[PDB]
Design a protein around this nucleic acid. Structure first.
Ligand SMILES: [Mg+2]
Ligand SMILES: [Mg+2]
Ligand SMILES: [Mg+2]
Ligand SMILES: [Mg+2]
Ligand SMILES: [Mg+2]
Ligand SMILES: [Mg+2]
Ligand SMILES: [Mg+2]
Ligand SMILES: [Mg+2]
Ligand SMILES: [Mg+2]
Ligand SMILES: [Mg+2]
Ligand SMILES: [Mg+2]
Ligand SMILES: [Mg+2]
Ligand SMILES: [Mg+2]
Ligand SMILES: [Mg+2]
Ligand SMILES: [Mg+2]
Ligand SMILES: [Mg+2]
Ligand SMILES: [Zn+2]
Lengths: 161, 177, 50, 92, 71, 47
RNA sequence: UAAGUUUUAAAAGGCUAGAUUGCCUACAUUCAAUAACACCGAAUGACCCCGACUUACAAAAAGUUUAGGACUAAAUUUAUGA
RNA sequence: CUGAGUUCAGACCGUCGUGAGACAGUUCGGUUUCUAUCUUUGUCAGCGAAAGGCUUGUUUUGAAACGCCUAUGCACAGUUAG
RNA sequence: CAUGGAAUCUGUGAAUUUGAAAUCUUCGUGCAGAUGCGAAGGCGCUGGCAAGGGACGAAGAGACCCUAUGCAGCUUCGCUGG
RNA sequence: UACCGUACUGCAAACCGACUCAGGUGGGCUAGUAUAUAUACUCAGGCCAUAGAAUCAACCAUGUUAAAGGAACUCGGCAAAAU
């Protein structure tokens, strides 16, 4: 449990902050058993634009969550795919969780730091063209049984005699 | 505001009619120069209808058909291809010279995308069906086509043996004038 | 008639109005320069350079 | 470029002195005359460029106009061989 | 033409129901390359699929044809 | 680049008919020594 | 579409909910991105759409046709008299 | 929706006034802003899950489906409300 | 009927306004025209696209009238001054 | 025979308007049908980057056509049409 310490104060502050949130993640909402997770910071999308896609993958298993992200033309779905793939990579290679039983049990969108701008309304009045950002937290639990896939897998156009 | 889809007519394709006809002429010229082009669904369906009209005009092989295609079809390298390779390739096909396969959406505007290609060529994606299907003279269809006024309409080579006895003659050559 | 474009740029007129020498030509222009110095402005006149 | 090979090695001030000498009433406003001469010099440099562009365009038009007819002659003489090949193999 | 009060979090959520997307109930999955798309769409290498190995089409033999190549 | 500022050059002449004439006594002359080759003092002194 | 053509009684006529009764081999994908064409339509035992051919006694909306798209199967037809 | 008239700013004619000016005396000319939050209203749509016990009517290898009442769904829907 | 907005999708992406709201109808009452009080009644819930009667919609602490130890400019046989 | 200017832009996304602003910004050169620098098409040359994609909403803007009438509309033939 880190008997060593960093040399500079900035690295030590960052490492202590990291251990504080690893404490808060354990024994809290869920926690407990071994969990693959990811945190995709500073997605260049609004919170509503990400929440449009996040309401589709909430509670689904992993393969049909990837299916729901891959079946829409939205820009936010590619970032959601990036977050789900990072969480899957952590869960399968960093941890030792079994695949094909992972459920997306926790996904939500939080605020990011905005970039304030200016928009030029008429009659001299100012406006805004603020560039919004957001964060993604994905937690993939492992179920006790492989679940119902929720979307029927059919054969493609290529698989034809 | 005039109804084009729902009342069988040409698509508007977000364009004025002169721009629309010019764009279809450019796309049919591109479709026969490279035999598979990729575009949005509305242009793809309009291209399929226009391709059937242009290919049949090339299949006539007449001087008036050449004159009409000369304005319709731009390249001239491919006016020859339409009147020779495409005309001989689909000489007996009753329409349907083109297939459409959907290919997803494009990145710039999320518009649906379709692959449009000429059928019955080396490099096509599905086997074609024969344009004709030689009939069994010992089946119901042949007798219905004997009692009713229907032709035989059999599959044929480019020059059948019914012209062989004329072309074999040495007194029917005229020396080439 | 749309307003807002009263500033028509010209180097001759800018130097001839707000330059150093018209400021030094009159006494009250010299006290204008003196209180620019007393305020501590980095640019004394519109045409100063080095 | 765009001007003749004799355009270099030829001082243009001979034109200035020539039309200043034989017309003695160009000496009224000499500075205006010199401005008109320099304006003539820049204008002549532009007209050389325009003449070059028109000549190259008119050459390229007939070159492509010949090459297109050559391509059509090649295409027709390639089609005739195939047609005579089909009728010849119908003979055999 | 102007809101008279500030919208509450509950009223805003109720008003935003039109903005949400419906989940799709079918998907066409390639067993080799694991690709996902609709059943009416090509998603092989000719379309966008950098993971395609060609195993998606399992048979394509067409050797014979004869024509005049226009040159 | 805006008002034709004259730099710190030394003038070598004057215009008479618009043609500049460089005065020959104002041309630059540099009194370089006879030989700077095998001269026993270098720009650096050993420590 | 009206300027055209029909109909405008006692109560007539419409809209929403519905006691009951009956039935159930019903997870809802494709045929074009605004089905309003089409749910009182179709998806290969399919003329649903599109194309091709014919019709001046339709100045063109019907008739034939599975050529193309709605994929699909074999030991008696790559297949309906669609 | 108009601003034709009732609020101005320009000018003329008449009345009153020393005059700046006043006239609800006559004339000519003279900026009509607003992207609907929710209250109504028209119309088009989404959400408002279930399976309950069968001591299973039966079977052994209280779990599995089977048979029941109605529960949803769908159809026709009071001499049936509004 | 034509073109371009509007309506559908993808991408970028404001502002006016805002005591808090979970804001029904009629009659009565009431700082005298009630979403909020009383009596009676109605109402599955939430929206898109439209229309704007209400929210004494929003936009200016000056349209008009009155007041100020109020200002300002103008006028004159108002007063006083070289 | 020195010194200063020489890039790029300059009816404009680079100047003046808070903006990549439908506004304002001086002078000069130019081919054919053809005839005037007007008008239609075009030469040299340049451009089709700054939201895209289909479709039949209502409604709005801008236009084309309209049977029989024709200012009957309206404060006023305003606006369109017409020569
Ligand atoms: Mg329209
Ligand atoms: Mg035109
Ligand atoms: Mg002007
Ligand atoms: Mg200013
Ligand atoms: Mg077929
Ligand atoms: Mg439009
Ligand atoms: Mg009341
Ligand atoms: Mg409603
Ligand atoms: Mg609305
Ligand atoms: Mg007082
Ligand atoms: Mg301009
Ligand atoms: Mg401005
Ligand atoms: Mg501009
Ligand atoms: Mg032109
Ligand atoms: Mg563009
Ligand atoms: Mg008439
Ligand atoms: Zn694959």
């Amino acid at each position: 449990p880190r008997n060593w310490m960093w040399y500079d104060a900035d690295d030590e502050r960052e490492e202590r902050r990291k251990e504080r949130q690893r404490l808060a993640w354990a024994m809290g909402p869920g926690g407990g058993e071994e969990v693959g997770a990811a945190h995709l910071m500073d997605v260049p999308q609004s919170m509503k634009k990400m929440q449009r896609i996040v309401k589709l993958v909430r509670g689904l298993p992993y393969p049909d969550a990837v299916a729901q992200c891959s079946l829409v033309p939205h820009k936010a779905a590619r970032y959601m795919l990036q977050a789900l793939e990072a969480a899957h990579a952590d869960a399968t290679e960093v941890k030792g969780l079994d695949a094909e039983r992972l459920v997306v049990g926790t996904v939500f969108v939080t605020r990011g730091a905005y970039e304030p701008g200016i928009s030029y309304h008429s009659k001299g009045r100012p406006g805004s063209k603020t560039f919004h950002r957001s964060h993604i937290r994905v937690v993939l639990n492992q179920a006790a049984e492989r679940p119902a896939p929720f979307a029927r897998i059919v054969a493609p156009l290529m698989s034809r005699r | 505001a005039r109804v084009r889809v729902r009342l069988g007519d040409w698509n508007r394709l977000n364009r004025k009619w002169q721009h629309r006809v010019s764009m279809m002429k450019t796309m049919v010229t591109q479709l026969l120069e490279k035999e598979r082009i990729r575009t949005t669904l509305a242009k793809a369906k309009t291209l399929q209808r226009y391709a059937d009209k242009v290919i049949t005009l090339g299949k006539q092989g007449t001087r008036e058909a050449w004159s009409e295609a000369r304005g319709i079809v731009r390249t001239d390298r491919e006016l020859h291809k339409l009147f020779t390779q495409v005309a001989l390739r689909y000489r007996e096909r009753p329409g349907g010279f083109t297939r459409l396969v959907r290919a997803g959406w494009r990145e710039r505007d999320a518009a649906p995308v379709a692959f449009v290609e000429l059928v019955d060529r080396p490099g096509e994606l599905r086997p074609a069906n024969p344009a004709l299907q030689r009939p069994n003279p010992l089946s119901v269809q042949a007798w219905i086509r004997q009692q009713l006024g229907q032709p035989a309409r059999e599959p044929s080579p480019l020059l059948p043996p019914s012209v062989q006895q004329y072309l074999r003659e040495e007194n029917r050559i005229q020396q080439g004038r | 008639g749309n307003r807002g474009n009263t500033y028509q740029p010209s180097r001759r007129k800018r130097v001839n109005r707000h330059g150093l020498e018209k400021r030094l030509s009159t006494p009250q222009g010299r006290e204008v320069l003196l209180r620019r110095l007393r305020k501590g402005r980095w640019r004394i006149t519109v045409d100063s350079f080095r | 470029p765009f001007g003749p090979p004799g355009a270099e090695r030829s001082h243009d001030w001979a034109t200035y002195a020539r039309h200043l000498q034989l017309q003695p009433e160009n000496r009224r406003d000499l500075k205006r005359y010199r401005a008109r001469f320099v304006r003539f010099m820049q204008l002549r440099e532009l007209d050389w460029r325009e003449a070059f562009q028109r000549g190259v365009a008119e050459d390229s038009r007939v070159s492509n106009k010949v090459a297109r007819a050559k391509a059509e002659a090649q295409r027709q003489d390639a089609w005739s061989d195939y047609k005579q090949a089909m009728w010849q193999r119908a003979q055999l | 033409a102007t809101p008279k009060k500030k919208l509450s979090l509950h009223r805003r959520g109720n008003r935003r129901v039109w903005y949400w997307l419906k989940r799709k109930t079918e998907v066409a999955k390639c067993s080799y390359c694991g690709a996902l798309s609709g059943r009416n769409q090509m998603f092989s290498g000719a379309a966008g699929n950098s993971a395609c190995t060609g195993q998606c089409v399992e048979q394509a033999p067409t050797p014979p044809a004869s024509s005049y190549p226009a040159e | 680049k805006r008002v034709h500022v004259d730099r710190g050059d030394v003038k070598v002449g004057r215009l008479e008919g618009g043609e500049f004439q460089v005065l020959p006594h104002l041309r630059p002359r540099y009194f370089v020594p006879a030989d700077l080759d095998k001269f026993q003092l270098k720009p650096y002194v050993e420590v």
